Design a protein around this nucleic acid. Structure first.
Lengths: 83, 103, 95, 90, 97, 78, 97, 83, 97, 78, 103, 95
DNA sequence: TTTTTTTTTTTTTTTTTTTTTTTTTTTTTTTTTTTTTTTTTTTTTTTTTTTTTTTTTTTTTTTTTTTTTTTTTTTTTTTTTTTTTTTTTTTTTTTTTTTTTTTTTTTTTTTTTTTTTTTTTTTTTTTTTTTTTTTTTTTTTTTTTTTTTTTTTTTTTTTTTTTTTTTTTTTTTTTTTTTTTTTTTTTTTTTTTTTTTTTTTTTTTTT
DNA sequence: AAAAAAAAAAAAAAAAAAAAAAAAAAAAAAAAAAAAAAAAAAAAAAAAAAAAAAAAAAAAAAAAAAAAAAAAAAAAAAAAAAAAAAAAAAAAAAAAAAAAAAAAAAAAAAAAAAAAAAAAAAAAAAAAAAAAAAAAAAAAAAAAAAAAAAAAAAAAAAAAAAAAAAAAAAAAAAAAAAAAAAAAAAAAAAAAAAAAAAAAAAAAAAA
């Protein structure tokens, strides 16, 4: 089907939840947009890395092993699914 | 040599020996060294051309590492490629923030 | 007597093609050779990474293709795939 | 008072603040926009979550420290911009 | 004739950005290297290539830190550097534990 | 000893960074920070040196130690 | 006279507790027990709150580890109502006596 | 002050909760006694470690890193509290 | 005269409990480990001391396996062993998944 | 090799261990467990043999590898 | 003859040698080598007496690691000492499960 | 060639003490040598880690005794510490 | 309950091999002086826990039924077991053969040591101004709370496809040899960049 | 505004040393054939996505209150900045020294391979009955949740005492050199114990 607009759909209160997870007490309202920007650029980077892995795997699905490959490739060292 | 038989400049047998001593896979395909040689040749062509442009800018005949640094630093994405990298006799570009100058 | 290896002939040829009327500093040359070795080892190590990932003990130019697609900026990457495919096909047609 | 109550409460646990449905929606957004015909991994989605909040909150506290280094408690986007500037990514 | 504050600073800044060279003469740096080296083992002959690369790398790293602090001061709305700036810069670099 | 880095040299490097007004406190603390940098690099380099089983340090040890942190430098033929 | 099936709340709180990371030991009774054994060994030991809390989560982690080991041994033993025999089996196989 | 009967501070619901954390589904009423005993014995082990450490610490105060030392002695290595 | 299962079995139990010497024939398992050790490095000579130490390490590991396997079968209400016991046991110990 | 250890060999091993009745799959399952453990052991052995630039895995290096895995054994002239 | 002066057997000079060539720290209290020597003669004497009793009970003048494993396995505390420590060709005691026994 | 370390004389005289007439096996003394080495290793490691927990670089009898009471069972530990006190007082009596 | 049938455990005699003393020595330790600074030692304090009480209510304990779980039996099937015969491949002694780690030591190459002068830097000192900080307003943005709903979350269902095993024939890459040809090093040149010097004009600062 | 003051760029001439190019050494890759094994192709299979739907309810969005905090401005202290000055050591080239590290050889271990002998491990067939486990029976136990209650928890506060920091000794441990032999390596002797053969007696299994 069609894909559209979900990216912006993230509720600003969810972002503020994450920010209180970040320990920030006072927050200008002008942050949600650039947070969207940075998150989407990072995740598109990683997802495209994953797609590259999968296409060289000739597989029509994705794998968490591929996920962690991309993660460590950008430098996000994380065990739990391996190592 | 197979270099001509592929139409390149890089040493195919030498680089294949490099791959062999690399200890990366038990066996490898024949065109793989050709492919990597081609891409490296492309990259070096690009960087040397930019450096030659830089040498034109400072009006010199030979090539200096400072030229290399200027050339790479001028382009954003090339810098991203050489992110955590630094170069002998590198230097930095002239970059001054707006408020720094007097009024 | 030490037989250290570099790419002075190769880099010199490239110099000629891009700028026939130019010289070189051996410092910049050492930088270039280290760059060559560096990119080589990076790409080849990631190819071996793939060799483990794909459960295959062999690498082809297709492996390198995917790897460079991983490693290089988009415009340079598509240029790169262009010449890589061209050179591989040219040699395979040739002997 | 309530803002800092939210501070402590959200810094309490390690549960997934985000909701599965919208997150998966964005996943499919950033997938299909490049290549079609992919069946996803729920585990991949979980990893996407974990990485996303981890990275974001990393930005969160270090930009918060920058902003208090800016002598203030109300944040500003340029604080984040400087933070990522030193972070070395672009 | 006496020059107003800042002129020397900016002129030297410009000339150094034009310049490409090390700004620390060798001998004190080498002596520091030598006195820190034996702290693990004595009688270590040094490579000039090694020590020169060391000098260059140290210089590059510290220059990077300098720009870090410059950005800090810009963020500080201040035109004077002070320690909490470098503290923040190091923390965000994460090189310090 | 460690004071071999002259404060005018520090001013010069600041000028390379375009710094304008510099307080004295920065001098000594940055001296310490670079000292930390130096001890890291030397300990890793000698780690590789003894790893190479020699009592003469080599530039290759230095460069490999640098790469141990992604501190890649060129111009020395690794 | 509401009655859930025996074990319904048990399993619901199974997921609730697995999804939670809260110390279940009551804090003051735990500090009292810490004092009890400390007196058993040597009195005049100021009780750091950090030390006591560390003891709390370490003890609870040891607990939960033994719980999965014993429960899974019992499941292998074709049983789910763990009884002490499974407990000493877990202890012996762990080596602890 | 000396206090007795303190192994019961982990009340029956507390024991049941800790079991649910370990995934135990059905519990016999006999489990609580053995759990109290094993908690007692291992916690006595760790406080013996702590008492020894503090007696040699030039201190009369069991502290957090003392607990860390006791843990790492009993095969309980972990991050968080220094080292 | 025919002997039913169990008697000579237990006689061999006790005879091999009192005995400790190698039951695995030396040369076949030696070839096994020669070929295994060859999987990574080449031109490997092999002094018999490390060979024997390897054999004993393997055998101690194995006897731990059997004792704990029989214990697990006891825990599972059996005297015949099927491999579910070994995965359960090694997972409790912590080596395998 | 892995059949240079035979089913009667596994019988003798189980009698030493007190096991009474054995399934068939037990044989190969335990053979594979032996394979994996022995392979990890020799991997550490070789890495610190040619780490110590030796063509042959020394029994002392074996002692080190096994003590790393917490399985200390006496009688090897350390 | 430091050992005779300290009233033990194990060489205090050699044990101090092994201490400081263990490179543990710079300066060392002089009581450490003597104390370590003493505790070692104690432990070896205890294990050796147990081994001798086991050997002579086994009607074996020579000490054997069968005797040593007997000594360690009979004593639960001495087992605790060698918890993750196993014996070289000591062997297992006859420890048969109850149900496996004949009726 | 090499004069490999051994404790054969010392263990042999310990034997001649505890059991005045008792035979030996070469593997038994090898076991003893390795055992003594292990005792040294573990005791020294614990002693050093203790000495650094309380921030001291002097290897005193204090940290070795605290380590051995950490490690040895009560009977063995108290007997060992009494033996250490005896031996050190004996040496201090002499020179 | 009684009787047979191995089968092990026990005692004598041979030998052999392992242990134990005795010889050699060299590689390790003791003693003594000398130094020296870490470790202790004493004081100050201060904080840091310990010690208690109130207020809120949260957690624990009790109880009843019902219900659902473990255990027990029996019956099945086959799961292992056991026996005798055949297969076999172990392992063991001496001989060949390799080969293979280690180690000395000439050379050789490469680092560390002195000198000096001298200059360009560092250091120092004295105005000062711009730079920082600090203090007041204020306003404005950022926030909480209620209600509404628009939203997410759960569980089936059915699909289906999409991965996944195995088997065969393929490529195809690996191995070893010969040959032949490549890359590196030295020497020489020249050809460039460097240094210095003069000229322009361009700003900073003063009038 | 306007003009002088360094300052710095532009041009030009000497100069020096670096780049590089021809020739030789050599070291290594192309080409060649044999083959032995990874992968491709494919057919089946079954595991998971995923599409959709109702049901439950929760998160959020808008509006309003509201409030504090950030930014702007004023103003003064001062401390780096910017002059002057004296001083010294970095260096650069030459001369000295000494030693880090390595190829050829060499002495010596250290494995590995084979003949083949015999010799007990392993294999297999083939009987066969016992045990693992399902079906079913008996049962008992613990879990759920409404009540009552114990006391944990949140929150303030008082004190005395552990020990942390600040100077300062001592003393304890280290460094080096002559004196001196000890702990290990070899030879040989001898006796502890397995080998072998068999006897006493006691579990195993049939009646």
């Amino acid at each position: 089907k069609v894909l559209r607009d979900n990216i912006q759909g993230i509720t600003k209160p969810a972002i503020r939840r994450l920010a209180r997870r970040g320990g920030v007490k006072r927050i200008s309202g002008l942050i949600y947009e650039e947070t969207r920007g940075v998150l989407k650029v990072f995740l598109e980077n990683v997802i495209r890395d994953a797609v590259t892995y999968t296409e060289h795997a000739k597989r029509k699905t994705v794998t968490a092993m591929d996920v962690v490959y991309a993660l460590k490739r950008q430098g996000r060292t994380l065990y739990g699914f391996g190592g | 040599t197979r270099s001509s038989r592929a139409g390149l400049q890089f040493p195919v047998g030498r680089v294949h020996r490099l791959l062999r001593k690399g200890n990366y896979a038990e066996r490898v395909g024949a065109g793989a060294p050709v492919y990597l040689a081609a891409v490296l040749e492309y990259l070096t062509a690009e960087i040397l051309e930019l450096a030659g442009n830089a040498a034109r800018d400072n009006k010199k005949t030979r090539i200096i590492p400072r030229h290399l640094q200027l050339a790479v630093r001028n382009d954003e994405e090339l810098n991203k490629l050489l992110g955590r990298v630094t170069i002998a006799q590198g230097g930095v570009l002239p970059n001054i923030q707006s408020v720094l100058l007097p009024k | 007597k030490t037989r250290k290896e570099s790419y002075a002939i190769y880099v010199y040829k490239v110099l000629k093609q891009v700028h026939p009327d130019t010289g070189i500093s051996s410092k910049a040359m050492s930088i270039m050779n280290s760059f060559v070795n560096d990119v080589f080892e990076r790409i080849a190590g990631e190819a071996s990474r793939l060799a483990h990932y794909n459960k295959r003990s062999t690498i082809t130019s297709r492996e390198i293709q995917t790897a460079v697609r991983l490693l290089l900026p988009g415009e340079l990457a598509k240029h790169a795939v262009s010449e890589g495919t061209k050179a591989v096909t040219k040699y395979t047609s040739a002997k | 008072t309530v803002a800092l109550r939210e501070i402590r409460r959200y810094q309490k646990s390690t549960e997934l603040l985000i909701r599965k449905l919208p997150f998966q929606r964005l996943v499919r957004e950033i997938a299909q926009d490049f290549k079609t015909d992919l069946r996803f991994q729920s585990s991949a989605v979980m990893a996407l979550q974990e990485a996303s909040e981890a990275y974001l909150v990393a930005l969160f506290e270090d930009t918060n420290l920058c902003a208090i280094h800016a002598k203030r408690v109300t944040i500003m986007p340029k604080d984040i911009q400087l933070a990522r500037r030193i972070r070395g990514e672009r």
